[PDB]
């Protein structure tokens, strides 16, 4: 009710409007260390 | 900008089916609660059914119970309403109609701010 | 459930003259907080209900400022100053503490 608000507030995302309020798809990768032992990283670059 | 559309509801032989499908345009539907309206013609309103967010909790008023089938979709913003064992007391003015309540305590089946535009449904 | 009244349901008010609406509730709908828990309808006859006054007392959104709610407790009462013809509709009250959402019989306000 009044000073009682929903907390969330939705964009509501309209094709119309102009970039800077256009919807993005954003992916973070993140890394630390030394938690285990290591497990990922590039592949081995073998020849004959 | 925030309006409510229905589909269906005609001309149908009692003790059968029928669909309703409600379709959602301008809000969030996911944290909108949803529930479920019965009129007469020449008498008033009765509430029949209402449901929270997600699916789970499902409730239905007393004459209605096992009667009339609820469901939700949450991807195409669409609530449908399956219809069992059509009685011509069940001849009434069906639209879906949400409700505010989004907190803890405002009760699902409460406060509804907005309503739905309208269909009849005539089981005879 | 809430044994719920609103008399008289058939009011023939001459255009202009104001109107009283009330409505009756068996438990009370003051909750904890101090606020008023009972809500004003009215339907046209052909399109979809309006919430009028929320909480007996406040503007819901597009209300003109001649429809005013009052009340406490129990006894509530709905009062238009001014009525005409754009005023001419069906009367409900709904309440908002226990689980089943109970509807006035609908008070049918006409013209004379």
């Known amino acids: 009710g009044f000073n009682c608000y929903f907390p969330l507030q939705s964009y509501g995302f309209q094709p119309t409007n102009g970039v800077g309020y256009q919807p993005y798809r954003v992916v973070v990768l993140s890394f630390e260390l030394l938690h285990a032992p290591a497990t990922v990283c590039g592949p081995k670059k073998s020849t004959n | 900008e925030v309006q409510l559309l229905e589909s269906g509801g005609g001309v149908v032989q009692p003790g059968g089916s029928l669909r309703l499908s409600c379709a959602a345009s301008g809000f969030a539907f996911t944290t909108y609660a949803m529930n479920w309206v019965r009129q007469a013609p020449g008498r008033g309103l009765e509430w029949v059914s209402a449901?929270?967010?997600?699916?789970?909790?499902?409730y239905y008023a007393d004459s209605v119970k096992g009667r009339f089938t609820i469901s939700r979709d949450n991807s195409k913003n669409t609530l449908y309403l399956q219809m069992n064992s059509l009685r011509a007391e069940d001849t009434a003015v069906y639209y879906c109609?949400?409700?505010?309540?989004?907190?803890?305590?405002?009760?699902?089946?409460?406060?509804?701010?907005?309503w739905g535009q309208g269909t009849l449904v005539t089981v005879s | 459930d809430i044994v719920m009244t609103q008399s008289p349901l058939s009011l023939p008010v001459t255009p202009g003259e104001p109107a009283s609406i009330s409505c009756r509730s068996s438990?009370?709908?003051?909750?904890?907080?101090?606020?008023?828990?009972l809500d004003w309808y009215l339907q046209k006859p052909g399109q979809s209900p309006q919430l009028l006054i929320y909480l007996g007392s406040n503007r819901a959104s597009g209300v003109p400022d001649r429809f005013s709610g009052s009340g406490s407790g129990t006894d509530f009462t709905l009062k238009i100053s001014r009525v005409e013809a754009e005023d001419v509709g069906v009367y409900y009250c709904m309440q908002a503490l226990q689980t089943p959402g109970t509807f006035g019989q609908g008070t049918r306000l006409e013209i004379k």
């Open positions: 109609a949400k409700t505010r309540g989004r907190g803890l305590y405002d009760y699902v089946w409460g406060s509804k701010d907005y």
């Open positions: 449901i929270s967010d997600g699916g789970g909790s499902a």
């Open positions: 438990q009370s709908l003051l909750h904890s907080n101090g606020y008023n828990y």
